[PDB]
Amino acid sequence: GVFNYETETTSVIPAARLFKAFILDGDNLFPKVAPQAISSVENIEGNGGPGTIKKISFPEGFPFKYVKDRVDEVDHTNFKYNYSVIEGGPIGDTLEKISNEIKIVATPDGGSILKISNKYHTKGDHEVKAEQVKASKEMGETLLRAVESYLLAHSDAYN
């Protein structure tokens, strides 16, 4: 029916600060920290709440130029942020709909832990290969990896 993948990551940066930048600055921080993944991100409708649509652009040399993204619901109190896409380059009506969920948690034992889950939906005639998911998993870590470097970049600032 549907494939469900879950990944776990840890970051010394606090979830409160990473949540605001990851959410409020997730559109700019995304490309700013990793411009090689998305050339630019635009918000079609919504202001970060549920039912918000955001357009994602991609640099030349990729499979699709841009992809449509939709947000399911974001909980500021639970620092939980999930989003799904209905229209994508390699995705049609439902050949490979992707729905990922993001959760941020703060912990004085090892900083804040991020939890990202990936879900693949296929009409049925087409199936998804596990290897294809592995490649997407690495990209997901590259997104949070560039964000962590952004927080450490402040140290390079004079003050």
Side-chain angles (χ1 to χ4, degrees):
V2 182
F3 300 90
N4 295 342
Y5 297 92
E6 301 183 350
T7 71
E8 298 186 351
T9 49
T10 310
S11 183
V12 306
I13 302 312
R17 301 187 184 174
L18 180 106
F19 183 86
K20 288 182 189 93
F22 184 85
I23 302 305
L24 304 186
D25 295 347
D27 289 348
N28 320 305
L29 194 75
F30 262 34
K32 286 189 184 158
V33 306
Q36 294 178 342
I38 301 175
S39 189
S40 291
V41 68
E42 173 179 14
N43 294 344
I44 299 176
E45 302 181 350
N47 292 344
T52 297
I53 304 176
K54 188 175 67 190
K55 191 181 184 110
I56 301 174
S57 67
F58 273 68
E60 300 182 352
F62 255 59
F64 58 94
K65 190 190 183 156
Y66 70 96
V67 62
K68 293 191 187 190
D69 187 88
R70 185 181 71 181
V71 184
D72 293 345
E73 187 181 1
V74 53
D75 291 348
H76 298 274
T77 304
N78 296 335
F79 301 99
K80 191 184 198 221
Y81 181 87
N82 69 344
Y83 72 94
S84 66
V85 307
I86 71 177
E87 187 179 352
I91 307 174
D93 65 324
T94 160
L95 287 74
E96 292 188 353
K97 210 192 173 221
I98 319 305
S99 183
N100 304 340
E101 301 180 350
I102 303 174
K103 188 184 186 127
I104 306 178
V105 190
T107 88
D109 293 345
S112 47
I113 309 156
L114 300 172
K115 297 185 183 82
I116 304 174
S117 304
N118 305 143
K119 280 182 195 146
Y120 301 90
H121 303 280
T122 67
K123 187 182 185 219
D125 290 349
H126 300 282
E127 300 182 350
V128 186
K129 300 196 180 230
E131 187 182 1
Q132 295 179 343
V133 183
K134 293 184 186 314
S136 187
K137 185 182 185 252
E138 301 183 346
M139 184 184 74
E141 184 187 2
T142 301
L143 296 190
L144 73 96
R145 184 185 296 219
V147 172
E148 292 183 354
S149 68
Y150 183 86
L151 286 310
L152 278 289
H154 298 100
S155 305
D156 295 346
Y158 198 74
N159 68 351

Short mmCIF file of all heavy atoms in Angstrom, two decimals, residues 100-145:
data_model
loop_
_atom_site.label_atom_id
_atom_site.label_comp_id
_atom_site.label_asym_id
_atom_site.label_seq_id
_atom_site.Cartn_x
_atom_site.Cartn_y
_atom_site.Cartn_z
N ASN A 100 6.26 13.71 4.02
CA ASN A 100 7.26 13.59 5.12
C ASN A 100 6.79 14.36 6.36
O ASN A 100 6.09 15.34 6.26
CB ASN A 100 8.60 14.15 4.65
CG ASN A 100 9.03 13.45 3.36
OD1 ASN A 100 8.56 12.37 3.06
ND2 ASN A 100 9.91 14.01 2.59
N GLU A 101 7.18 13.91 7.52
CA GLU A 101 6.78 14.61 8.77
C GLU A 101 8.04 15.03 9.53
O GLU A 101 8.98 14.27 9.66
CB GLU A 101 5.95 13.67 9.64
CG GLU A 101 4.71 13.22 8.87
CD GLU A 101 3.88 12.27 9.74
OE1 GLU A 101 4.38 11.86 10.77
OE2 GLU A 101 2.76 11.97 9.35
N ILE A 102 8.08 16.23 10.03
CA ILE A 102 9.29 16.69 10.77
C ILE A 102 8.93 17.02 12.22
O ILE A 102 7.92 17.64 12.49
CB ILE A 102 9.86 17.94 10.09
CG1 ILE A 102 10.17 17.63 8.62
CG2 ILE A 102 11.15 18.36 10.80
CD1 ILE A 102 10.58 18.91 7.91
N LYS A 103 9.74 16.60 13.15
CA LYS A 103 9.45 16.89 14.58
C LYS A 103 10.73 17.39 15.26
O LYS A 103 11.78 16.79 15.15
CB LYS A 103 8.98 15.61 15.28
CG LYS A 103 8.48 15.96 16.68
CD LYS A 103 8.09 14.67 17.42
CE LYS A 103 7.46 15.02 18.76
NZ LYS A 103 6.13 14.35 18.88
N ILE A 104 10.65 18.50 15.95
CA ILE A 104 11.87 19.04 16.62
C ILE A 104 11.72 18.89 18.14
O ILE A 104 10.68 19.19 18.70
CB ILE A 104 12.03 20.51 16.26
CG1 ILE A 104 12.04 20.67 14.74
CG2 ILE A 104 13.35 21.03 16.83
CD1 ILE A 104 12.15 22.15 14.38
N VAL A 105 12.75 18.44 18.80
CA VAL A 105 12.67 18.27 20.28
C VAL A 105 13.96 18.80 20.92
O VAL A 105 15.04 18.60 20.41
CB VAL A 105 12.51 16.79 20.62
CG1 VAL A 105 12.18 16.64 22.11
CG2 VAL A 105 11.37 16.19 19.79
N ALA A 106 13.84 19.49 22.02
CA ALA A 106 15.06 20.03 22.69
C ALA A 106 15.45 19.12 23.86
O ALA A 106 14.61 18.58 24.55
CB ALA A 106 14.76 21.44 23.22
N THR A 107 16.73 18.94 24.08
CA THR A 107 17.17 18.07 25.20
C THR A 107 18.56 18.51 25.68
O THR A 107 19.50 18.55 24.92
CB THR A 107 17.23 16.61 24.72
OG1 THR A 107 18.52 16.36 24.17
CG2 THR A 107 16.16 16.38 23.66
N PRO A 108 18.68 18.84 26.97
CA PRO A 108 19.95 19.28 27.57
C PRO A 108 20.96 18.13 27.66
O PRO A 108 22.08 18.31 28.10
CB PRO A 108 19.55 19.73 28.97
CG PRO A 108 18.30 18.97 29.27
CD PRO A 108 17.58 18.81 27.96
N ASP A 109 20.57 16.95 27.24
CA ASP A 109 21.51 15.80 27.31
C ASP A 109 22.36 15.75 26.03
O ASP A 109 23.50 15.33 26.05
CB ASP A 109 20.71 14.50 27.43
CG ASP A 109 20.01 14.47 28.79
OD1 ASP A 109 20.37 15.26 29.65
OD2 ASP A 109 19.11 13.65 28.95
N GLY A 110 21.81 16.18 24.93
CA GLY A 110 22.59 16.16 23.66
C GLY A 110 22.02 17.19 22.69
O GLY A 110 22.03 17.00 21.49
N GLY A 111 21.53 18.29 23.19
CA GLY A 111 20.97 19.34 22.29
C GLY A 111 19.54 18.96 21.90
O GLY A 111 18.80 18.39 22.68
N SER A 112 19.13 19.28 20.71
CA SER A 112 17.75 18.95 20.27
C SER A 112 17.80 17.79 19.27
O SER A 112 18.70 17.70 18.45
CB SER A 112 17.11 20.17 19.61
OG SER A 112 18.02 20.73 18.67
N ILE A 113 16.84 16.91 19.32
CA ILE A 113 16.83 15.77 18.37
C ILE A 113 15.76 16.01 17.29
O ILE A 113 14.64 16.35 17.59
CB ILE A 113 16.50 14.48 19.12
CG1 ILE A 113 17.44 14.35 20.33
CG2 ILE A 113 16.70 13.28 18.20
CD1 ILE A 113 16.78 13.46 21.39
N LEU A 114 16.11 15.83 16.05
CA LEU A 114 15.12 16.04 14.96
C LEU A 114 14.60 14.69 14.46
O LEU A 114 15.35 13.75 14.31
CB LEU A 114 15.79 16.79 13.80
CG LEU A 114 16.31 18.14 14.29
CD1 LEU A 114 17.15 18.79 13.19
CD2 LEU A 114 15.13 19.05 14.64
N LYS A 115 13.33 14.59 14.21
CA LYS A 115 12.76 13.30 13.73
C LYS A 115 12.07 13.53 12.38
O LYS A 115 11.08 14.24 12.30
CB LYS A 115 11.75 12.78 14.75
CG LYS A 115 12.46 12.48 16.07
CD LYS A 115 11.48 11.84 17.05
CE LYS A 115 12.17 11.61 18.39
NZ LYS A 115 12.17 12.88 19.17
N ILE A 116 12.57 12.94 11.34
CA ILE A 116 11.94 13.13 10.00
C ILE A 116 11.45 11.78 9.47
O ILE A 116 12.18 10.81 9.46
CB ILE A 116 12.96 13.72 9.03
CG1 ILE A 116 13.52 15.02 9.61
CG2 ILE A 116 12.28 14.01 7.69
CD1 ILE A 116 14.65 15.54 8.71
N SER A 117 10.23 11.71 9.02
CA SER A 117 9.70 10.43 8.48
C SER A 117 9.34 10.62 7.00
O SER A 117 8.81 11.63 6.61
CB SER A 117 8.44 10.04 9.26
OG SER A 117 8.74 9.96 10.65
N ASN A 118 9.65 9.65 6.18
CA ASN A 118 9.34 9.78 4.73
C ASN A 118 8.28 8.74 4.34
O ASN A 118 8.35 7.59 4.73
CB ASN A 118 10.61 9.55 3.91
CG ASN A 118 11.70 10.51 4.39
OD1 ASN A 118 12.86 10.15 4.44
ND2 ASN A 118 11.38 11.72 4.75
N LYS A 119 7.31 9.13 3.56
CA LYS A 119 6.26 8.17 3.13
C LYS A 119 6.11 8.23 1.61
O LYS A 119 6.09 9.29 1.02
CB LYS A 119 4.93 8.54 3.79
CG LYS A 119 4.92 8.03 5.23
CD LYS A 119 3.57 8.35 5.88
CE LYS A 119 3.68 8.19 7.39
NZ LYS A 119 2.82 9.20 8.07
N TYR A 120 6.01 7.09 0.97
CA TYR A 120 5.86 7.09 -0.52
C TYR A 120 4.50 6.51 -0.90
O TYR A 120 4.10 5.46 -0.41
CB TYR A 120 6.97 6.24 -1.14
CG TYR A 120 8.32 6.79 -0.74
CD1 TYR A 120 8.95 6.33 0.42
CD2 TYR A 120 8.94 7.77 -1.53
CE1 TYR A 120 10.20 6.85 0.79
CE2 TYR A 120 10.18 8.28 -1.16
CZ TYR A 120 10.82 7.82 0.00
OH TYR A 120 12.05 8.33 0.36
N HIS A 121 3.78 7.17 -1.76
CA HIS A 121 2.45 6.65 -2.18
C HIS A 121 2.48 6.33 -3.67
O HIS A 121 2.94 7.11 -4.48
CB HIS A 121 1.38 7.72 -1.92
CG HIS A 121 1.39 8.10 -0.47
ND1 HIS A 121 0.78 7.33 0.50
CD2 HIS A 121 1.93 9.18 0.19
CE1 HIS A 121 0.96 7.94 1.69
NE2 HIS A 121 1.66 9.07 1.56
N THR A 122 1.98 5.19 -4.05
CA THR A 122 1.98 4.83 -5.49
C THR A 122 0.59 4.34 -5.90
O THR A 122 -0.05 3.59 -5.20
CB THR A 122 3.00 3.73 -5.76
OG1 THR A 122 2.59 2.53 -5.12
CG2 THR A 122 4.37 4.15 -5.22
N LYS A 123 0.13 4.76 -7.04
CA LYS A 123 -1.21 4.33 -7.52
C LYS A 123 -1.33 2.80 -7.41
O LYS A 123 -2.37 2.27 -7.08
CB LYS A 123 -1.40 4.74 -8.98
CG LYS A 123 -2.84 4.47 -9.41
CD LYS A 123 -3.01 4.85 -10.88
CE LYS A 123 -4.48 4.69 -11.29
NZ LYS A 123 -4.56 4.13 -12.67
N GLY A 124 -0.26 2.10 -7.68
CA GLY A 124 -0.31 0.61 -7.59
C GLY A 124 0.45 0.01 -8.77
O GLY A 124 1.32 -0.83 -8.60
N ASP A 125 0.13 0.42 -9.97
CA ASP A 125 0.84 -0.13 -11.16
C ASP A 125 2.34 0.17 -11.05
O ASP A 125 3.17 -0.60 -11.49
CB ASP A 125 0.28 0.51 -12.43
CG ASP A 125 -1.15 0.01 -12.66
OD1 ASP A 125 -1.55 -0.93 -11.99
OD2 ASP A 125 -1.82 0.57 -13.52
N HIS A 126 2.68 1.28 -10.47
CA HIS A 126 4.12 1.64 -10.33
C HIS A 126 4.57 1.41 -8.89
O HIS A 126 3.86 1.70 -7.95
CB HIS A 126 4.33 3.11 -10.70
CG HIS A 126 3.88 3.34 -12.12
ND1 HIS A 126 4.66 2.98 -13.20
CD2 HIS A 126 2.74 3.90 -12.64
CE1 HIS A 126 3.98 3.32 -14.32
NE2 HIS A 126 2.81 3.88 -14.03
N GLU A 127 5.75 0.88 -8.70
CA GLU A 127 6.24 0.64 -7.31
C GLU A 127 7.51 1.46 -7.07
O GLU A 127 8.14 1.94 -7.99
CB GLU A 127 6.56 -0.85 -7.15
CG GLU A 127 5.30 -1.68 -7.40
CD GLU A 127 5.61 -3.16 -7.19
OE1 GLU A 127 6.78 -3.49 -7.04
OE2 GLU A 127 4.68 -3.94 -7.17
N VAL A 128 7.89 1.63 -5.83
CA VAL A 128 9.11 2.42 -5.52
C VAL A 128 10.23 1.47 -5.07
O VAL A 128 10.01 0.56 -4.29
CB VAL A 128 8.81 3.42 -4.40
CG1 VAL A 128 10.02 4.33 -4.19
CG2 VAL A 128 7.59 4.27 -4.80
N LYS A 129 11.42 1.68 -5.55
CA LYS A 129 12.55 0.80 -5.15
C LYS A 129 13.16 1.31 -3.84
O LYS A 129 13.25 2.50 -3.61
CB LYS A 129 13.62 0.80 -6.24
CG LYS A 129 13.01 0.29 -7.55
CD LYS A 129 14.13 -0.07 -8.52
CE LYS A 129 13.53 -0.58 -9.83
NZ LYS A 129 14.16 -1.88 -10.21
N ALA A 130 13.58 0.42 -2.98
CA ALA A 130 14.18 0.85 -1.69
C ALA A 130 15.41 1.72 -1.97
O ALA A 130 15.65 2.70 -1.30
CB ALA A 130 14.60 -0.38 -0.88
N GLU A 131 16.20 1.36 -2.95
CA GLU A 131 17.41 2.16 -3.26
C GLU A 131 17.01 3.62 -3.51
O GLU A 131 17.63 4.53 -3.01
CB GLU A 131 18.08 1.60 -4.52
CG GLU A 131 19.42 2.30 -4.74
CD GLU A 131 20.06 1.78 -6.03
OE1 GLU A 131 19.46 0.93 -6.67
OE2 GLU A 131 21.15 2.23 -6.35
N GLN A 132 15.97 3.83 -4.27
CA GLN A 132 15.53 5.23 -4.55
C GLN A 132 15.31 5.96 -3.22
O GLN A 132 15.64 7.12 -3.07
CB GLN A 132 14.22 5.21 -5.34
CG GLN A 132 14.47 4.58 -6.72
CD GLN A 132 13.16 4.54 -7.50
OE1 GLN A 132 12.10 4.66 -6.94
NE2 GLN A 132 13.20 4.37 -8.80
N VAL A 133 14.74 5.29 -2.25
CA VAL A 133 14.49 5.94 -0.94
C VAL A 133 15.83 6.27 -0.27
O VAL A 133 16.00 7.31 0.33
CB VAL A 133 13.69 4.99 -0.04
CG1 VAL A 133 13.38 5.69 1.29
CG2 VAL A 133 12.39 4.61 -0.74
N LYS A 134 16.79 5.38 -0.38
CA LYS A 134 18.11 5.64 0.25
C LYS A 134 18.66 6.97 -0.26
O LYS A 134 19.15 7.79 0.50
CB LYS A 134 19.08 4.51 -0.12
CG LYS A 134 18.62 3.21 0.54
CD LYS A 134 19.64 2.11 0.25
CE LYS A 134 19.11 0.77 0.78
NZ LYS A 134 18.58 0.96 2.16
N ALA A 135 18.59 7.20 -1.54
CA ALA A 135 19.11 8.49 -2.10
C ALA A 135 18.36 9.66 -1.46
O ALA A 135 18.95 10.65 -1.08
CB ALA A 135 18.90 8.51 -3.61
N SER A 136 17.06 9.55 -1.35
CA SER A 136 16.28 10.66 -0.73
C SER A 136 16.68 10.82 0.73
O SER A 136 16.77 11.92 1.24
CB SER A 136 14.79 10.33 -0.82
OG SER A 136 14.03 11.46 -0.39
N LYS A 137 16.93 9.74 1.41
CA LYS A 137 17.33 9.83 2.85
C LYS A 137 18.60 10.68 2.97
O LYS A 137 18.70 11.55 3.81
CB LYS A 137 17.60 8.43 3.39
CG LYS A 137 17.88 8.51 4.90
CD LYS A 137 18.19 7.11 5.43
CE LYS A 137 18.34 7.17 6.96
NZ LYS A 137 19.77 6.99 7.32
N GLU A 138 19.57 10.43 2.13
CA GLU A 138 20.83 11.22 2.20
C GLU A 138 20.51 12.70 1.96
O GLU A 138 21.04 13.57 2.62
CB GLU A 138 21.80 10.73 1.12
CG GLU A 138 22.10 9.25 1.35
CD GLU A 138 23.14 8.77 0.33
OE1 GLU A 138 23.37 9.50 -0.63
OE2 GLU A 138 23.68 7.70 0.52
N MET A 139 19.65 12.99 1.02
CA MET A 139 19.30 14.41 0.75
C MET A 139 18.66 15.02 2.00
O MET A 139 18.94 16.14 2.36
CB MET A 139 18.31 14.47 -0.42
CG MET A 139 18.02 15.94 -0.76
SD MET A 139 16.76 16.02 -2.05
CE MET A 139 15.34 15.57 -1.02
N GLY A 140 17.80 14.29 2.65
CA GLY A 140 17.14 14.83 3.87
C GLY A 140 18.21 15.21 4.90
O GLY A 140 18.14 16.25 5.53
N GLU A 141 19.20 14.37 5.08
CA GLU A 141 20.27 14.69 6.06
C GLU A 141 21.08 15.89 5.57
O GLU A 141 21.56 16.69 6.34
CB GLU A 141 21.19 13.48 6.22
CG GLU A 141 22.23 13.76 7.31
CD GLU A 141 23.26 12.63 7.34
OE1 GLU A 141 23.14 11.73 6.52
OE2 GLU A 141 24.14 12.68 8.18
N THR A 142 21.22 16.03 4.28
CA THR A 142 21.99 17.18 3.73
C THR A 142 21.25 18.48 4.05
O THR A 142 21.85 19.52 4.24
CB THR A 142 22.14 17.03 2.22
OG1 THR A 142 22.80 15.81 1.93
CG2 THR A 142 22.95 18.20 1.66
N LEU A 143 19.95 18.42 4.11
CA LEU A 143 19.16 19.65 4.42
C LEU A 143 19.40 20.05 5.87
O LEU A 143 19.72 21.19 6.16
CB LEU A 143 17.67 19.37 4.20
CG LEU A 143 17.41 19.05 2.73
CD1 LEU A 143 15.91 19.00 2.47
CD2 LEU A 143 18.05 20.13 1.85
N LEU A 144 19.24 19.14 6.78
CA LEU A 144 19.46 19.47 8.22
C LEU A 144 20.95 19.69 8.47
O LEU A 144 21.34 20.46 9.33
CB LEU A 144 18.95 18.32 9.10
CG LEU A 144 19.91 17.14 8.99
CD1 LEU A 144 20.90 17.17 10.15
CD2 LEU A 144 19.10 15.84 9.04
N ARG A 145 21.79 19.03 7.72
CA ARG A 145 23.26 19.20 7.92
C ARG A 145 23.65 20.64 7.57
O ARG A 145 24.39 21.28 8.28
CB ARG A 145 24.02 18.23 7.01
CG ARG A 145 25.52 18.33 7.29
CD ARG A 145 26.28 17.46 6.29
NE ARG A 145 25.92 16.03 6.50
CZ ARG A 145 26.83 15.10 6.41
NH1 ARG A 145 27.35 14.81 5.25
NH2 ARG A 145 27.22 14.46 7.48
#
